[PDB]
Amino acid sequence: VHWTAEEKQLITGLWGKVNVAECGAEALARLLIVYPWTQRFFASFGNLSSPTAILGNPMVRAHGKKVLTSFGDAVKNLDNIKNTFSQLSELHCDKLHVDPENFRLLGDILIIVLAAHFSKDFTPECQAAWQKLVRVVAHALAR
Amino acid sequence: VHWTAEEKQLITGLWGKVNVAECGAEALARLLIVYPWTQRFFASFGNLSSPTAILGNPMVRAHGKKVLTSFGDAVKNLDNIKNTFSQLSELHCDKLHVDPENFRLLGDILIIVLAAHFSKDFTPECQAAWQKLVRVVAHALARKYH
Amino acid sequence: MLTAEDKKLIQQAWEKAASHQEEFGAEALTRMFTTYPQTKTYFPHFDLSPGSDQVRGHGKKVLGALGNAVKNVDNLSQAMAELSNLHAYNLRVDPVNFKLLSQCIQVVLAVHMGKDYTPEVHAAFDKFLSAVSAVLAEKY
Amino acid sequence: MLTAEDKKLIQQAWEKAASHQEEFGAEALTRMFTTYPQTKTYFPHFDLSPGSDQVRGHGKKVLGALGNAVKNVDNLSQAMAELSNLHAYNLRVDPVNFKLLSQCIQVVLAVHMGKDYTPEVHAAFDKFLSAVSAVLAEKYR
Numbered sequence: 001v002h003w004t005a006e007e008k009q010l011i012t013g014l015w016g017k018v019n020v021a022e023c024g025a026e027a028l029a030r031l032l033i034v035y036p037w038t039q040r041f042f043a044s045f046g047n048l049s050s051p052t053a054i055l056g057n058p059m060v061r062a063h064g065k066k067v068l069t070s071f072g073d074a075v076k077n078l079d080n081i082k083n084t085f086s087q088l089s090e091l092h093c094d095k096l097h098v099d100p101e102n103f104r105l106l107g108d109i110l111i112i113v114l115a116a117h118f119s120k121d122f123t124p125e126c127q128a129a130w131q132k133l134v135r136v137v138a139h140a141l142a143r
Numbered sequence: 144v145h146w147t148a149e150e151k152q153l154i155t156g157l158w159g160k161v162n163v164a165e166c167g168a169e170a171l172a173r174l175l176i177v178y179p180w181t182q183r184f185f186a187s188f189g190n191l192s193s194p195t196a197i198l199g200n201p202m203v204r205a206h207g208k209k210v211l212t213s214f215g216d217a218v219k220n221l222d223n224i225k226n227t228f229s230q231l232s233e234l235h236c237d238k239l240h241v242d243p244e245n246f247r248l249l250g251d252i253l254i255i256v257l258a259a260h261f262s263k264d265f266t267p268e269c270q271a272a273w274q275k276l277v278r279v280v281a282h283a284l285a286r287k288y289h
Numbered sequence: 290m291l292t293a294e295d296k297k298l299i300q301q302a303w304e305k306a307a308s309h310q311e312e313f314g315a316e317a318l319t320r321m322f323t324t325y326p327q328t329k330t331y332f333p334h335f336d337l338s339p340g341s342d343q344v345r346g347h348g349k350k351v352l353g354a355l356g357n358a359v360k361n362v363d364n365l366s367q368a369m370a371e372l373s374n375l376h377a378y379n380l381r382v383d384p385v386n387f388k389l390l391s392q393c394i395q396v397v398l399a400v401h402m403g404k405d406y407t408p409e410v411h412a413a414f415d416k417f418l419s420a421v422s423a424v425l426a427e428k429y
Numbered sequence: 430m431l432t433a434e435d436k437k438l439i440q441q442a443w444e445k446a447a448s449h450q451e452e453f454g455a456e457a458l459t460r461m462f463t464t465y466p467q468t469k470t471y472f473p474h475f476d477l478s479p480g481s482d483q484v485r486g487h488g489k490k491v492l493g494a495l496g497n498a499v500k501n502v503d504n505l506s507q508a509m510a511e512l513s514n515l516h517a518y519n520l521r522v523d524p525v526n527f528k529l530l531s532q533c534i535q536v537v538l539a540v541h542m543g544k545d546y547t548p549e550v551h552a553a554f555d556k557f558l559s560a561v562s563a564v565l566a567e568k569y570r
């Protein structure tokens with residue numbers, strides 16, 4: 001819960017170059033295809049029968065964007081993340097019953113998405129700062 | 144951390160009949176034998192080459208008692224657990240680097256120990272209350288990772 | 290991986306459960322639903338009352354499967370085939386839940402075997418259950 | 430254990446890594462030590478400096494093993510035998526750590542394959558790594 005100047009920098013800087021919509025769709029899409037059991041929470045999305053159907057699915061793509069957009073809320077509230085994700089916690093936990101292990105799984109995927117989109121610019125130091133952010137957001141959601 | 148009267152009751156009542164030393168030794172012993180990788184944190188204990196050696200090992204037995212004794216600190220501090228386990232958090236996290244998944248593994252074992260020691264008296268409601276306590280203590284200990 | 294000796298232990302642990310399938314199975318599910326409420330989500334069609342004919346009926350089917358698992362403990366994937374397909378593909382059961390049922394089954398055994406549920410038996414049974422859980426989330 | 434078409438995907442993905450073993454391996458370990466500091470605990474004898482001859486030397490051995498895993502992706506248990514014995518028995522590596530290395534290896538691939546690290550390849554590689562991780566903690570006792 002101790003954010004260093006270096007970390008905040010690494011996080012903010014990179015965030016500014018993120019294509020929220022494209023990365024969000026890729027993160028959510030990858031989640032559903034790499035960890036299939038997660039599809040059961042998204043039945044109202046329609047066709048999720050193949051990676052192809054999932055990638056092209058309008059709601060997956062539009063949902064992913066909403067997901068990454070909230071991460072952006074964490075990016076500009078790093079010291080007040082818990083308070084920021086309280087409501088979302090209730091939703092995922094009370095209303096939806098999403099096991100927390102899944103939150104971590106999405107974070108890991110997001111990290112792999114950012115890496116494929118920034119290549120070498122995604123330095124080990126950068127990875128470490130993002131992996132920390134992801135871990136913090138996952139814990140904020142599992143309150 | 145919303146503790147109900149029923150829960151506090153089920154926790155306190157059962158605690159009063161626990162043989163701290165015997166259950167503690169069994170919990171810690173089972174941990175080391177069911178999840179072997181955990182032995183690497185207890186090399187200074189000596190012989191842990193067999194379940195037999197582990198069960199008879201004086202330090203395992205004496206350590207287990209210390210572990211269950213702290214749980215007892217949680218039992219009489221339910222509303223102030225986090226503060227109670229802060230220091231222990233630093234130790235397990237900073238000084239020792241014990242992955243949190245292991246904390247949960249010990250809790251599960253403790254639950255199985257209590258069940259073998261109280262049988263039918265360990266009701267599903269009772270189990271649920273203890274499993275909650277274990278989860279809370281594990282989270283209190285994992286404060287130094289974040 | 291599953292040893293020779295463990296096979297003997299789980300067989301002697303089983304011999305105990307084998308005669309109380311309906312009760313043990315029912316108690317296992319009841320403990321899971323009670324301790325891990327989130328699991329109820331998979332049985333919206335069931336009456337989750339403790340004495341439910343449904344719960345009991347299911348519990349009996351669960352322990353029956355484990356029994357057959359024991360019998361074919363040396364080729365679980367080809368025996369649990371149908372079940373992994375159901376749980377993975379049809380039901381989409383989050384793998385985290387298999388750990389939850391496994392702990393509850395073990396609590397039931399400890400409650401009824403008391404001192405006889407020794408570190409050695411505990412260890413052999415824990416491997417068996419984790420192995421079975423692995424084969425159930427082995428498709429998709 | 431493994432699938433089929435996935436075997437082709439991981440083989441593709443591998444052909445990329447196979448030519449940069451020393452670099453990819455070294456980057457993988459460096460990322461792990463950097464992101465998950467706790468892992469350093471297993472290498473008290475190593476110089477964990479990013480350009481360490483040791484790290485690079487190890488990284489090359491790690492990726493070499495994975496390569497042989499790919500070649501025998503259909504009998505993993507009997508090939509990684511010596512390695513599971515070392516990691517489980519001798520080292521007592523907590524299984525949680527295998528997940529950590531696996532993610533780092535994947536980050537290295539994504540960084541160098543960019544768009545080519547597709548959901549399909551990602552999925553096949555993730556299965557392969559998890560499978561390999563399982564066989565390494567198979568002797569867990």
Ligand code: HEM
Nearest residue numbers: 038041042066067070071088092098102103106137138141
């Ligand atoms: C740590 C990452 C996560 C974040 C930040 C996050 C964020 C969000 C947000 C912002 C919404 C709100 C939708 C709205 O109000 O319009 C949402 C909804 C939801 N999320 Fe999450 N989520 C996360 C992880 C997950 C995971 C792991 C799953 C399950 C595999 C999941 C399943 C869902 C579902 C089913 C909904 C409701 C969708 C609907 O409204 O139809 N989320 N998520």
Ligand code: HEM
Nearest residue numbers: 181184185209210213214231235241245246249280281284
């Ligand atoms: C959630 C359950 C846990 C509790 C409540 C707990 C509690 C304790 C306590 C009270 C001590 C302090 C010793 C002292 O000051 O005299 C201790 C030490 C230690 N614990 Fe934990 N512990 C837990 C889980 C674990 C786990 C999972 C491991 C690792 C597998 C572990 C490894 C150790 C080690 C190696 C020490 C230091 C032993 C020494 O002083 O030589 N503990 N634990």
Ligand code: HEM
Nearest residue numbers: 328331332350351354355372380382386387390421422425
């Ligand atoms: C590791 C232990 C497990 C075994 C051996 C097992 C076994 C069974 C069996 C034999 C069936 C019924 C087959 C049939 O009638 O066609 C079944 C169905 C099912 N199981 Fe499992 N199961 C296991 C774990 C779980 C878990 C952890 C969950 C999820 C929380 C679960 C949820 C269900 C559901 C919802 C069904 C469908 C029930 C129905 O058709 O009404 N099972 N299980």
Ligand code: HEM
Nearest residue numbers: 468471472490491494495512520522526527530561562565
């Ligand atoms: C899943 C990927 C893994 C593979 C394929 C792998 C492979 C290797 C290989 C081939 C060796 C050296 C064999 C020799 O020189 O005799 C080795 C040794 C070792 N590995 Fe692993 N490893 C893996 C995961 C890990 C993880 C996650 C850790 C722990 C954080 C770890 C810690 C070590 C250590 C400390 C050694 C001993 C190094 C030495 O002898 O100085 N490995 N590994």
